[PDB]
Amino acid sequence: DLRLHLLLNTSVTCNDGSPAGYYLKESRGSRRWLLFLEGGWYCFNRENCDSRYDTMRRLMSSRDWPRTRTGTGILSSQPEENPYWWNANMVFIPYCSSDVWSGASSKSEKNEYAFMGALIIQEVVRELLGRGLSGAKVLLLAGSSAGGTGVLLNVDRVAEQLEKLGYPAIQVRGLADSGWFLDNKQYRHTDCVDTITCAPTEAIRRGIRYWNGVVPERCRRQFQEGEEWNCFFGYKVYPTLRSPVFVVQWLFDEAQLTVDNVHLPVQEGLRLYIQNLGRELRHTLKDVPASFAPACLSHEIIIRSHWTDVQVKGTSLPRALHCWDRSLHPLKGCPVHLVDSCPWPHCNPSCPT
Template sequence: LLGTVLLGARRFRGGRNPQPRRAPPSPTYRERGDTTESFPLDFTAVEENMDNFMKQVKNLAQSLYPCSAQKLDYDMKLHFLENSSVTCNDGTPAGYYMKESLGSRRWLIFLEGGWYCFNKENCDSRYETMRRLMSSSKWPQTKTGTGILSPLPEENPHWWNAHMVFIPYCSSDVWSGASAKTDQSGYAFMGSLIIQEVVKDLLTKGLDKAKVLLLAGSSAGGTGVLLNVDPVADLLERRGHTTVQVRGLADSGWFLDNKQYRSTDCHDTVSCAPTDAIRRGIKYWGGVVPERCRLAHLGEEWNCFFGYRVFPSIKSPVFVVQWLFDEAQLTVDNIHLTGQPVQEGQWRYIQNLGIELRNTLKDVPAMFAPACLSHEIITRNYWIDVQVKGTSLPRALYCWDRSFYDNSRNNKAPPKGCPVHLIDSCPWPHCNPTCPTIRDQFTGQEMNVIQFLMHMGFDVQKMAQQQGMDPSKLLGMLSSGS
C-alpha cells in the first residue's frame, strides 16, 4: 500500500487541479457504487511520517475518484442519548454529534465549553441569553468539525482519520453535575452523566474495538477533561474494555484560583472570584469530582476544578494546552481589556499571571503553552500555525502519541526533534510572533506586536531600561519576533 501511495503521489502531485473528464462508469460499476465500500485499514501503524502519508493518501484518492471525492460527507450528525433520563438543564434530551471513519481504531470525543452558572438567578439569565448552552431544543441536525475535529488532513494532519464525536455543552456545570431537575433548582445538572452515557452509546457503535480514545475539550470543556478522563477510563475498565487507551487533551481549562486584580461582589461568573463561583456551583449542581482528588481535598472538593490541584491525582495521560495569558482567566481576575491602555498595575498583574501559570505547568510532562493573549485553540482553523520553540501543536500531539508507541516497544529515548514539553519563556503577551492575530476592539484593524503592546500601555523606554538595552534595539527585537 505504501509503495502504491508513494508512486501515486508522484504521478498525481498537484492532484487538486481539475482532472480530465472520464467516461461514465458502466451500469455494473454504478450498481456496486450504490453501497458504501469500506477498507478496514488501521493507519495508526504508520508512525514514521504520518502527516505526509495521510496527505498522500487523500491526494491519491481524490485523483483516482474526483467525482466521489466531491460527494464526501464531512459533517457530524446529531444523535440523542439512548437513556432519555439524562438531560440538558431544561429537561430536553442530551446528545452528541458523530462522524464515523471506517477502518480507524482511534476515537476523539470533544467536550464543548461555555462558562457556567451557579445559582437560580444567573442560570435564569443564562437560559434567556444563551439557551443553546442549556437546551437541545434548537440544535441543528449536523455540525462541521474544525481544527482537531476537521476531517481534512491539511487542517488536521494527525487526527483527521479518527471517529469524531462532539458533545454539546448543555449542563452549565463544568461537566461535573449528577443531579436531576428539582423544583428548588429549576434545572438538571448532569454534565458528568452525559459523558458517561455518550461513552456507553458509542460502545455499541464501535468504540469497544478502539485502540485509543482521546477525551478533548476547550475552556469549561478543558476543565471537564481533567474531571472526567479517569472516570471514563474506569467505566471502560469496568465493562471489560481494558485494551482501549484513554488519554486527555485539556485546552484552555487550566484555571488558577488566584487573587483577583480588583475584588468585586459575586453576582455572576464574570464578577465572581473563581473560587467563590466554584464553591457555590459545586453545591448547586450536586457536582462530582474524581475519587482520588476528592480524597485529597475532603470537604474542599472545589479544589479539583483547578488544573494544578487536580492534575497530580489523574492516572490517565493528559496533554495540557494553555495560553499563558488566557483571556477568560483575565476576565474572572477583573482585568478587562476595553481598548484603553492598561494601567501600570494591570500590566504588572498580566505579566505575573504568565509567571504563575508557568510555575503551575512546570511539572506537567506533556504541554503546549504559548505566550499569547487568547482563549481556546484546538478547534480553531489556525491551530496549526501557532508554534512554541519552532514546534506546532499538531506536531507536539503527534510526538506525544509517538511516545506511547515507542514506550510500548521499550524504546525509552524520545525521537529527536519531537518535543512534548513546550512552554514560552518570553515575559509578555504576544511576544511569540506566531500568536493569533489581534484586532483593535473598536476599529477592527489588525495590530502587529509593537502596536499591540503600545495599545496595552507598554512603555518601551522603561522596559528597555529594565532589560539593560537601548530602546531602538528592543523595538527591533520585538519587530523581528525575537
Template sequence: MQRLAVRSCMLLLLVHLCAPGQVKRARGRGAQSRRVQQQAPAYTERVEGTESFPLDFTAVEGNMDNFMVQIKNLAQSLYPCSAQKLDQDMKLHFLKNESVICNDGSPAGYYLKQSKGSKRWLVFLEGGWYCFNRQTCNSRYETMRRLMSSTKWPASRTGTGILSPQPEENPHWWNANMVFIPYCSSDVWSGATPKSGHGDYAFMGSLIIQEVINELLTKGLNNAKVLLLAGSSAGGTGVLLNVDHVSEQLKVQGHTGVQVRGLADSGWFLDNKQYKFTDCLDTISCAPTEAIKRGVRYWGTQVPENCRQAHLGEEWNCFFGYKVFPTLNSPVFVVQWLFDEAQLTVDNVHLTGQPVHEGQWRYIQSLGQELRGTLQDVPAIFSPACLSHELITRTNWLEIQVKGTSLPRALHCWDRSLQDNTNVSHGNHSTLKQRTPLRGCPVHLVDSCPWPHCNPTCPTIRDQLTGQEMSVIQFLKHMGFDVQKMAQQQGMDPRKLLGMLNNGS
C-alpha cells in the first residue's frame, strides 16, 4: 500500500504542475484524493520544471487491477487539462535500413508507442495468409496490396486487446512499450530474399523483424527486462519461426538481460489431410503442406536452427507448430482455437449458409481431437473449443474463458511462473514441463468438450446468410448435429443432452 501511495503522489504532482489552479478546485472530490494531495508537498522539491518522469509500475503487478482503477479515477478527477492529453496511438516509423523492404520494394516499418519507465516490450507480428509463387503473389497484390506494400499505411494505429493502452481492456500489459509490425512480406515472416528485378517480389519477413529489433535497441529495448514477441495467424506462426532468432540476436549484441518470450495466436496449423483434395491453384484451397513446400523455395526461408537440423532438406516441417515447438529454446505461450476457421478453410471445409452433412461434421470433430492431441505437451496453452480465428487483439478477449480462466489471467500466471522460477533456465522446455504450476494460477488450459462452441464463453455465432445471432443449439443443428443420435450414442436422455449443451457442459 505504501508503494501505491507513493506512485499516486507522483502522479498527482505531475498533474499539479500541469494545471495548479485546476487541481486546487478539484480538492474535496473524494477522501482518497484528499489523502494523496496532503502527501504531495513532501515530493515537491524532488521535481524540477514541468517535465514528465518515468514511472515503473511493474513492481505492483501483483495487485495491478486495483492499482489501475485508483490511478485512472485519480487522473480523471484531477487532470482537466484535456488539451495536453497524451496520445495513446502507435506511430509509424519506416526502417532506416532502406535495403529491408516490403514485397513491392516500398520501405518496411513498424508502429511504436513507448511507455517511459516500463521495462517490458511487446512486439506484435500481423497476420494475413501468404502467397507462394508469381501467380498467387500477383493476385494478392491486386486484391490485398496493403499486405505487400507500405505505400498506403496510416500514420498511426490504435492498439486493441493485448496492444491496448487501456488497463480495463488489457489489465497486465497495458503499460508495456507497444510495437506493431505490419505484415508486408507474404512469407509467414520467414523470408530473406531481396527484390531481384522489375516485376519480382522481395520476401524479407525474417529480416524485417531483425531490423526492427535493431532499431528498438536504440529506443530503450536495450534496458528491457522482458521482450514478448507476439503474433496472430501467419504472425503466430512467425513467432514460432523467429522467437529463437530474436533471442540469439540480443545475446550476440550483448543484451543478455532481456528475457525473450513468445505468444503464438492462431498459428498452430496442422499438416493434415484435406477434407476434399484440390489442385494447388490458389492460396485458399491449396493444402498447407503443398503451399508451404512451394513457399519455402520461393521465399528463401530461414527457420530456427534446431528445427532445420531436425528436418534437413524438409525445412517446411518447421512451419507446423507441433513440429517446431519441441525444438525451441525460448518459452512460448500458445493460443489456439480447437476449431480454427483458417485451418478448416485450407482443409476445404467451407461453412457457408447450408448445413454441413455428416461427413463434414465427423471431419470437424476429428480435427479438434487431432489438434488437442498435439497440445498435450505444451506447458502454456489456452485452447477454447470454439469455431473462430485470432484472439489476442480482440477488444473482448477478456470474455473468453477455458475452465473459468481468461486468457489475460493465464498470461499473467505464465509471467509469474517465469519470474518466480528464476533458478530455472527460461529456455529449457523439458525443465518447464517438470515444474509445478503456481497454485490457483493455471497455464495449461485446453477444453475437453468435443464439438464447436461447447464452451459457453465462445464468441457470438451469426448465421452467414442472415447475420442473425444463433444459439448454441441452433448452431449445432446448422452444423448437422443430431441431438437424438448423439444422445443415443452417449446413452442419455436427449433432454439432458440439450441441457448440457445449453450450459456448455
C-alpha cells in the first residue's frame, strides 16, 4: 500500500480550501521515483464546479480521502503485475484541483474555489526531496487522461525547479497516458451555450482565465497572450519540450469520441469520421520517437491491473518502456516507437475487452 501524506504547506489546497497531499510507498534500495498524476475531467465556471462539488467531491476535497491506497498497474510493487518499475519508489498524487493540473490561484473573496494544480506538483516535489528524492537518478512524471495532459504541461517545470534548487543530477522524464487530444472537427456541432454543448477548445479557454492557468513557457511565447489554450493539445506543446516524454494513446480514445459527439450499426458518414480520426492521430505521432498507440476503442491503461496484456506488433507496453529506459543510457529487437497501422477499432486482437 501507499500511505497518505497531507502537504505540510497548508496554503496549497484542493478546490474547497482543504490541504492537498500524496500517497507514498518508499523503497530505500532504489533511486527511481514514479510520480503519477490522477485524472478526472475538469470544471471551468462557478456553476458546473458547484455541480462537481455535489457528486464528485473527492476530486475537489481531501476531507474524505482514505488512509492508504493500493498501487495497481505501473504503480504496483509486484513484478508479476509491473514488469517495468516494480522496485521503484511509488507516489500517487490525487487530482483535486479540476484544472488539468494547470491552476495557480488560491481561494479568496474573489474566488469561490482554489485552482492550484500546477503548485500542487511543485510542493509535492519539494517535500519529497527531504524523504529520499534528493538521492534519485530518474524522476518519471506519469499521468492518465487529465493527468496525462498535466504531464505535458508540467514536466519541464519539474526539471527546471530541481535545477534551481541544486539537484542537476536528477533526470526528469514524462509518461503521458491518454492525454493526447485533437482539436478536430466534430461529428455533430453545437455552439457553447452550456456545459454539454461547449467543445474543449472553448471550455479550456474559459478555464484558463477562471483557473489562472499556466502553460510551458516556451510554448507560451509561440502562441502568446489569449492563445494559451493551444498548449493543452499534445501535438502543439510536445515539440517545445526538452524533457524526454513517452506518449501512450489509444487510436480511438473514448474521451476524444465523447467530445466529438460520437456514441456507438455504423453507417458510411460515421465510418469515414472514425477512420479519419485514427489516421489523423497517427500523423501526429509520426515524429514522436517514443510512443505506443494501439488501434482500440478504450480509455486509460497504465494503472489498470491487466495493463501488460495489450501488444502492438508483438511488444507489450512494459517492454517498450523498458526499451525506452535503455535508449536513454536503435536497439536490436527492443523497439520504442509502436503505432498500429490498421484502420478500425479492435483490428488489433490484443485490445481490452
